[PDB]
Amino acid sequence: ETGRVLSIGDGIARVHGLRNVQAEEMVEFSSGLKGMSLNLEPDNVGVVVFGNDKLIKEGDIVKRTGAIVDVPVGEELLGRVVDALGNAIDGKGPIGSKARRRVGLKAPGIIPRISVREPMQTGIKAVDSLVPIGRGQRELIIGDRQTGKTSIAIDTIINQKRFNDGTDEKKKLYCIYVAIGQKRSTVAQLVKRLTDADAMKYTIVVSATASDAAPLQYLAPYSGCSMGEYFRDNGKHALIIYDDLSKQAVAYRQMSLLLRRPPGREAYPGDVFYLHSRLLERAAKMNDAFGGGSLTALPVIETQAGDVSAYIPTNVISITDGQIFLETELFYKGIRPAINVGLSVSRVGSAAQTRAMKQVAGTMKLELAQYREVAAFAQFGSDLDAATQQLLSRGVRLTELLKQGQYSPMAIEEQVAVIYAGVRGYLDKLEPSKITKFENAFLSHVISQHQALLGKIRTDGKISEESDAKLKEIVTNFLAGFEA
């Protein structure tokens, strides 16, 4: 049924036997420890141990499972917290895992799919206007440590309350959250954050951390994928967040090096691209003939001193359908969430907004990449013609708009509200140092007064000359009532 252990060290067990073992097939150990075959060589199987290899000793017994590696799936996982193999670890006794999907699934080819059309809202003004995500998209969050990379992915799940506590069965989005490499002290503090704001209910949270074995971080984001593959392959909407792929890669490197696979750039192994490529392809927008179901994926990357030449950060950017950059510089400068518009792209553009947003911000992304350059050219105090005197006279106010609090998403309707304020030029005459006490009022004033207008735009997701007309006064009915 299976055989010997030739030698063991560093999570790498050589095995003399297992002669009919499948490559990539998981073995089991004497001590009851699940391992894994990865090197099928002439005279031995190198096996990556999925845990503390102290228990293993030369000579122990390794037995086949026959199975390629797999994990628990389905709604029976929501609200839980499972390790990289599906096992529960929040102390609430096993999950109801009737559904059991394989980790090593290849991604949907060409036909099973359809252009990404479905707005995946983050509730972050910055993202939802200038780099909008859509269901099936891979949008990378990349940045130096402590820039806000996570308070993105968290603020987004916490936004999905609104839709998951309602009726409309398309607007619903179940969330997985892989946590690779982090410290338990944090994974936890984070679940606590989810729980509080009440979002934990619609959210798997697979967690393979610091102390967890190496192959367990290697695998974690895959497992957490299969779990999200179900939700799409069965006509529902998933948003998985790998946080972060940087730490995962490092892990894969360890296995690979210990397995004696000759090292490449920065020591990583050759396929270190394939690793993130394949995983990240598995997020798609399935076409109707297949469920209509989706899997939006926010991978996360962490840079050193901003170096986006680093082997990895360049790989993952080449893979995802765009990205948000972070930048500590903007952060302290006041631009929280620190984003760098001009350098953030969404390779799906408006094809993933409401026609409500699109109308307030569809050519303002190529405007805050020219008002940018046209305030960096005439930085100095001189003179400039009739055309470029205004662009600046505007922007400064506009940016004060995407300045946003934390753990406080916004529903698309309200976003369109404030964005309208400026973009149509109803702020083009206000001192920026106030454009926040302003918004914080004009938006609680037009929720207490006109649940009316929101009603329409929220639903039909557009601003008819009707809706627009009402606005055109509700606004005006405010600037003159403060300054003038």
Added chain:
Amino acid sequence: LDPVQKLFVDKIREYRTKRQTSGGPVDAGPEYQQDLDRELFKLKQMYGKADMNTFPNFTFEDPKFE
């Protein structure tokens, strides 16, 4: 599946002579007690050190200011 359903019975011919043998946790030796005191300290920690059988009185405090 027919020479194994009764070997799982060598496990309640003892489970029996245990959950009936009163007179103290069986054959303990010293160990049994000491440890049941260390975990009697730390479990007496997160909560406090006062009387757990009585209803606590109440000292109250004014509202500070920043």
Added chain:
Amino acid sequence: YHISVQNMMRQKEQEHMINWVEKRVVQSISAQQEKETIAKCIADLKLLSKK
């Protein structure tokens, strides 16, 4: 508090309780030479079934 002063108690005891099982069964086979007959028994019922 007592939700816990009884929690460590029902478990710990039931540790020594199910563990006590071990040492009385290692005494049952090591001793009882008539528990070396119930050895060759159940085991020869292996070769068979498998085939």
Added chain:
Amino acid sequence: FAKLVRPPVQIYGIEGRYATALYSAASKQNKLEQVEKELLRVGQILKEPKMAASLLNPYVKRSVKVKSLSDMTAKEKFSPLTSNLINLLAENGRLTNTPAVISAFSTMMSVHRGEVPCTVTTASALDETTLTELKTVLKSFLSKGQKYVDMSAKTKIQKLSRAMREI
């Protein structure tokens, strides 16, 4: 060029590469057995108190070590087409290796003959048959005639288990 009699034991992949040779060098003249015993003998012509002052001696070298192995071949019960697996290890500087080369000669011989599965507690079943676990029963008849999370893990822990009846 020559085709090779790879006998379904195969063994190595890197080192006892001479061994995998003579199941193919032998299987032409069917002198498999002539050597199966020839080697057994040389395995101790070298473990003498008179042969270790070269066995592991980079002192004499490929000079008087190969033509001083025209003796421990020609002389004794050898001098066939197997006095050469020595005359190779002699030149190719791996006399210090032959024990392992004989070892594997066996484990490849007794897979054209015997089978190797072993009992639990003592010796070799040598089930030299056309069928595995056929004669595994009818040859061990000459052997007579000569549940709460934790208790789960602690029951399989004695069955086929541990340090007990192992001794």
Added chain:
Amino acid sequence: TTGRIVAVIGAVVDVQFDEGLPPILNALEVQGRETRLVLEVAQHLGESTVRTIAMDGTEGLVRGQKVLDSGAPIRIPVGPETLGRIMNVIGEPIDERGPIKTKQFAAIHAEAPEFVEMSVEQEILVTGIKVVDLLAPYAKGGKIGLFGGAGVGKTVLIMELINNVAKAHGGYSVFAGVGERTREGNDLYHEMIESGVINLKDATSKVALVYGQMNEPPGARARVALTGLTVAEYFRDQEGQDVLLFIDNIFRFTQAGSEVSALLGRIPSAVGYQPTLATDMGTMQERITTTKKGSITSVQAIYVPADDLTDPAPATTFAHLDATTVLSRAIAELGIYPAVDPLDSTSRIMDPNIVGSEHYDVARGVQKILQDYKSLQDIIAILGMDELSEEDKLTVSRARKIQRFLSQPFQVAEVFTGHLGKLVPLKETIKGFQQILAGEYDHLPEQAFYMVGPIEEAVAKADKLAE
């Protein structure tokens, strides 16, 4: 004959053969799979064993599994019945439409068009994209390359290329997505069925699709491009036809080659590419060519790893081109799409004796003034603008105009831009710039040239921005 797997790591499987040692390149057959697995032979380690790359994932194989010497190199559905059909690495169709039906098959490992077959005729293929045509026109039936770091508009360009060039074309086109995004294939299929260069009904399909994306193994990606070109190599040699071969992204070929190289036994070379990055490219670019027998206009897009145009991959690619459009992040970042570097882009036919002294003299004049503006660039922005000559505030003025008039609302980019597509005929481009250059619009303000089509459409925005 029959062979047995001896060992398996990641993407490299060694196999042992009783008798029939398959020649390097020979496609081998893995017996026992729920989906076909081929192993292109790669070397003879000896002792009747051969190391090989898998054209799909080796999850599942087992030491001893049955392998059969398919006797010859991978072979594909070359032929006319490939149009409208999505092929792949090994021929197998994957639009779900049951076997591709032809009785002509060719190995994807050919030799290369000898010296004497080389065609020396080059004539200007206009693309209607102003920047390319003005400063670096492509040539009918020539090797074109699209250089780009990630996200700078490489792929979008090649779309607006297949939209323009490949629609008003009555020949055959072969687009092969090597190693990039699967999303983007599905994305094109449907645009290319809306336009119906692919028609599901009749047989009027003008476009063969070969595909092997970033979700497949290194084996696949390493050879997907070898396939898609075998496909377009037929339509050339036979028809005598005008085959348009697009690749995206010819980079993934050398990268893919990289991933396995390690496991194949290679001391790595500089930047850690295969010691063979050079020739691997050679005996493969040297096939994507134009013989006397036929012509292939080729439009490759090359990833520049981290934008370093010196990275041994994009670097070695330059030798193999006749016209190179190089994309700039710094330009894109300024909103000037298509971010073509008007000073790193080059054509072989930018010769006054080929494009005329008007064209040439005008391109080079634009190139010059942009270069001069680049020169004043760190005087001015740190030491007071108006401290410039009269001559210079002038060559700045015009330059920034020229520099913006070089942008174009692309038709496949309306989704991003916000303006309706566009397309300018060569002579209205030459004229447009010749003018700006000549000092005829020094009065109209900057933004008027930003993202318009023919020069007049800027005089349009010239008043629209006014009153």
Added chain:
Amino acid sequence: TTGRIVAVIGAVVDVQFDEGLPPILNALEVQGRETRLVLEVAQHLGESTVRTIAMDGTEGLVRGQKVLDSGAPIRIPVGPETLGRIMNVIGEPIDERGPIKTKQFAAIHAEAPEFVEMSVEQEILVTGIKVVDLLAPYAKGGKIGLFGGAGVGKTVLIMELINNVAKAHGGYSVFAGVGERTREGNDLYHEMIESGVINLKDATSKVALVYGQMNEPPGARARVALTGLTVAEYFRDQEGQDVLLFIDNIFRFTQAGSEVSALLGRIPSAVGYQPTLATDMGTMQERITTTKKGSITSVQAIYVPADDLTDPAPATTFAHLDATTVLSRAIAELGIYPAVDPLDSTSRIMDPNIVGSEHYDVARGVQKILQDYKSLQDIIAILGMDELSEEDKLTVSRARKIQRFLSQPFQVAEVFTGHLGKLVPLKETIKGFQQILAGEYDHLPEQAFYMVGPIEEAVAKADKLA
């Protein structure tokens, strides 16, 4: 049983057991020297040989030489009979005060606190150090990291913290010196006997000392980080107590790793480090934590090689902290002590809901003007102050004061500063800056804010000059 040394190199030794074979992690015991030479199995090479990391010099060992299995990990004294005693990496005592008679023992290795045991208790821990408090406050029972290159003042800062913190602290403190200066230990010892945290007379001692310094072999430096670890662990668990764990220098742990990884036979990773830098660390690291049971406030000094904050060592470690203080040579060279980078030190509790949005507001307001100054930094260097717009001429002057008012003369380097050691309470910290920020002080010279306590000593100073 018994086996023999068959290979020795550096701190890596290869033992052959014919009978039996020790689990990976079993402390072996060399038989033949006047000095307890523990080996520690780390690999089974097969052919019934194991590979081990020494815990001391290996001069002398011979191919031959017997070794006895201990049947267990390296195990050391734990309990209250450690407080006041200096012990080495294997538990042996080294304060020449007899043995450490103690009830129980623990092993140095140990699995780490399961997810259920974590605690999200976030309460601020004031240091009385202006920069730390105002911009990135330490958290009670939190992990704290002090990053610095050679000589920027980690050790001083850890000392000041030990003083402003562990002196008036009802609760046990453990200090692990990992591969730093032996004379720093001698220095601590005496300094803590005088001050009386250690008492030779009683068992009133409040601190345990574990030391394995930069003179001991890789193995020893490799491990000792864990010895002291285990100790703190006990005081947390079997005492549900308030533990203070100070390490200096946690870097030397990964470094020592590197020295051995070479001959253990791993293939080198980035920058030459061990393949296993992230987990080797992360196991060890995740044991240092506050659980439901006990509570450890950890403070680890982290060396940064060649000032490279991206070197894997410092680089990886960041993941593991809740508050970080980063020291820049750049700053220190301008006599701004403590050398804290205000735009690079962070805490996972700078959050209005936790520190009260007056704190969070004065913070990010300082953090802003500073990072605004920092942007002008380039034009000021090439064209000079004058080319600065009027608005900007200010943003500098104010910022430059903030820059200067974050300096604070520590009660330790009363010797280098000469100046009297101040400790500033959160209130007057938050206040003073607020004022500086609202420009009450644009009338005072820069120096006036350099090296002072509350904002009074500032305005006060400004006079003595005039």
